[PDB]
Structures are given as C-alpha cells and as structure tokens.
C-alpha cells in the first residue's frame, strides 16, 4: 500500500563509472525492499533482497543498503551489458508495490552512422505499395535527423522510424526510416534520397538511388 519513488528516472553513464540508484518510501518498510534488473524483451533478474543482501549468482559490482524510507542500489563499475531498467519493490503491507524503475543507458563515445538505402521489392510492387527503407547503422548518440527527398523534394508525414534497443556489446543504436508511398508515386519521380545529420558526422550524409 506504500508507494515507492525511484530516482533518478534515467541514468546515463560511461563504462567504468559508479552508478547509484535510489528508492524512497512514503511509509517505512523497515528492511523489506528488493532490486531487479530487466533488459529489453526479457524477464526481470533479481539482484538484492532485504535491502542489503546480494541474491545468488549476482556479480560483485551490484550492492544494496538502507533501512526505513531511503534505500540504495549501486553498480561499482559499469559494464556495457548493464544497459537495463532497474526496479525496487516493498513487501510489508498489502498490496505489494513495485517502483517505477530507473532506466540505465551506457554513455559510449561518438560513433557516426553507416547509411544504407533500400528500393522497394518487385514482390511488393505487385500489391501497389512502395516502401523505401533507410538504415542508420551502429551510431551514438541516439539523436539523429533523417530527411527524405524525392527528386530533391522534401517528404512529410509519410515516414516512420524505429530505433533498436542499445547494443549490449558496443552500446550503439541503429535506426530504420521507412518511407511509405503508393506504387504510382514511386514511378512518377526518379531520385530517392535519405539525408542524415548526426553529431558523429562533420557534414550531413545523403544516400540515394535511381528507381
């Protein structure tokens, strides 16, 4: 019945840095407080139980401490694989309450994207729809501007991008921009351009093809 207020909501730190994650309770829970690690698309993985006690199998770098209302999870020296959300939770009074989580991002050095472009397939053209896919591969940071030009004309409101979850090995993101237009629109115009602005580039990079 006691709400938990985890802080900070997000933490971005480089490999080898100490990470300190806080969990605050509106009402005492004495020592009944737990810690879990969840990576993208996986089950949670318990870390600490009873505020201070490391759970079986959990490496040396994770630790816990606290009693009363203020609690602390620490990762002594961050690893590229520690990219995850981290949850606190209390079990004193009913109902059982979890914390909202702390998202941990790994802050590597600037990596420029590799840019590819993909003309819609012949299989797809039979249906009457044309998807033009631009790929920004292995870049950091996440912030990247993608611009669609068709015969040097700016596209607007016909593109959707998605970003992969951080790569647990090299900490980079990849980005997929798909331009969606009709079969007829794709054949009235000739040149298909994907322009990319990123911190890692000294100038914007345009990848393009002729239909």
């Amino acid at each position: 019945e006691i709400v938990l207020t985890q802080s900070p909501a997000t933490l971005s730190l480089s490999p080898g840095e100490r990470a300190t994650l806080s969990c605050r309770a509106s009402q005492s829970v004495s020592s009944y407080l737990a810690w879990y690690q969840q990576k993208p698309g996986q089950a949670p993985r318990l870390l600490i139980y009873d505020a201070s006690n490391r759970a079986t199998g959990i490496p040396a770098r994770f630790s816990g401490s606290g009693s009363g209302t203020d609690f602390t999870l620490t990762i002594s020296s961050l690893e590229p694989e520690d990219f995850a959300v981290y949850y606190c939770q209390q079990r004193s009074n009913w109902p059982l309450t979890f914390g909202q989580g702390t998202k941990v991002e790994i802050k590597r050095t600037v990596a420029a994207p590799s840019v590819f472009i993909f003309p819609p397939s012949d299989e797809q053209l039979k249906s009457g729809t044309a998807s033009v896919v631009c790929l920004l591969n292995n870049f950091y940071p996440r912030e990247a501007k993608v611009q669609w030009k068709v015969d040097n004309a700016l596209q607007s409101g016909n593109s959707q991008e998605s970003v992969t979850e951080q790569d647990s090995k090299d900490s980079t993101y990849s980005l997929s921009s798909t331009l969606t237009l009709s079969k007829a629109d794709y054949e009235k115009h000739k040149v298909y351009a994907c322009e990319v602005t990123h911190q890692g580039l000294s100038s914007p990079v345009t990848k393009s093809f002729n239909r």
Binding site: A43, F118, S131, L135
Partner: protein, 213 residues
C-alpha cells in the same frame, strides 16, 4: 536447474477468458508462495496474484474477482485463469516465486504476451531488403496484427550481427518491422541468406530467400 516454461499467451477478445500455464522445476509449488506478475508494453511491473503456502490467495484489486491463481500439485504446472478481459489487461505475464519472510523472487518464467483487442488477426507480408566491402541485407515484415513476430536467419544459424527493429504501429492499425544482418561480402555467391518469419497468431510461417539485386 530450475526451469519455468509458460504457455497460453496470445490474442483474445475483450470480454473473453484466457488460461496461462507455468510448468515448474527444481522446487515444489504446493509449499512455496507463488506469484503472477504482469507488465504492460512500455510500462513498469505490476503484481497480479499471490498464492500462499497454506492455500490463501491474494489478488491485486485490479484482477480481484476475475482472475484465479491455482496450483496443480501433481502436474507441477501452475495456472492463471483470466476472465472479463479488457485492453488494460494487455501485458506480458510472468510466473515467479514469492518469499514470505523478506526473501526473493529468485526464478522467473520467460514471460508470455497477452493481447486484448477485438481487431482480427492479420498475417504479415515478407518483402526482401536487397543487398547491393560490407553488405546489408534484411526482410520487411509489413502489415500484421497483433505482435509479436519472430524473425530469425538461416533457421537460427545466422544469429551474429542482426538487428531486428522494434515494430511501429501504422495508421492502418497494422504493425510493420524490418530485420537486417550485415554479412561478409565474399559469401554472397556461396552462402544463401534466408529470413524465417514466424507469426503464431495467424499461424503464418514464411521463409524468404534474399538475393542481391
């Protein structure tokens, strides 16, 4: 070696019912406090139901009266029977062991996605992403409902250097996705690259060979 397998997850109509199974190993369900935990997409973890060692059952006020947590002592399998399902119930469901004193949720099931929507199932189209020093090639899994699709390469052989992007929801009401995998350019001629798209809700299972254009 504790192993918790889950089954039952998928698409159900609002108002409908759905049962989930969590087969156990390495301990005894009967004597342990057991739990169902759910997680809505893009959100935190919500406790659903606890079943005590003594048989007492406690539920979150959200599921109270609609869900029954029950244990099958003989089978080792554990169940969550859901009723009166709503969109708010869409979530990945987890079975996990609850400690009575102050202990641990030590083991967890892999989780099983439950989608509560009245929209009909639609199988995806699988279009090739044509490769043209280093080559990028993929498959476009377009127009499907609901999630998920499992995209593999070469029957789970080509697992290294693959990016299968999180699915975006198109205005149409259907999901779309792309899956890329960078490969040595020298192996374009010899090694053939095939994506395997499996979508359980529509029972679709497309194999698509991708060749350079």
């Amino acid at each position: 070696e504790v192993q918790l397998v889950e089954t039952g997850g998928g698409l159900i109509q609002p108002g409908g019912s759905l049962r989930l199974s969590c087969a156990a190993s390495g301990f005894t369900v009967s004597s342990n406090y057991m739990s169902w935990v759910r997680q809505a997409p893009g959100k935190g973890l919500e406790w659903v139901s606890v079943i005590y060692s003594g048989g007492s059952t406690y539920y979150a006020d959200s599921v109270k009266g609609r869900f029954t947590i029950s244990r099958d002592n003989s089978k080792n399998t554990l169940y969550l029977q859901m009723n009166s399902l709503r969109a708010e119930d869409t979530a990945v469901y987890y079975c996990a062991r609850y400690d009575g004193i102050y202990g641990e949720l030590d083991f967890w099931g892999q989780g099983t996605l439950v989608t509560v929507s009245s929209a009909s199932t639609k199988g995806p189209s699988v279009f090739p992403l044509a490769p043209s020093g280093t080559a990028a090639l993929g498959c476009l899994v377009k127009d499907y409902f609901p999630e998920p699709v499992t995209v593999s390469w070469n029957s789970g052989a080509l697992t290294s250097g693959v990016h299968t992007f999180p699915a975006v929801l198109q205005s149409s009401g259907l999901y779309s996705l792309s899956s890329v995998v960078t490969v040595p350019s020298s192996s374009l001629g010899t090694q053939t690259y095939i994506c395997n798209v499996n979508h359980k809700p529509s029972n679709t299972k497309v194999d698509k060979k991708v060749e350079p254009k």
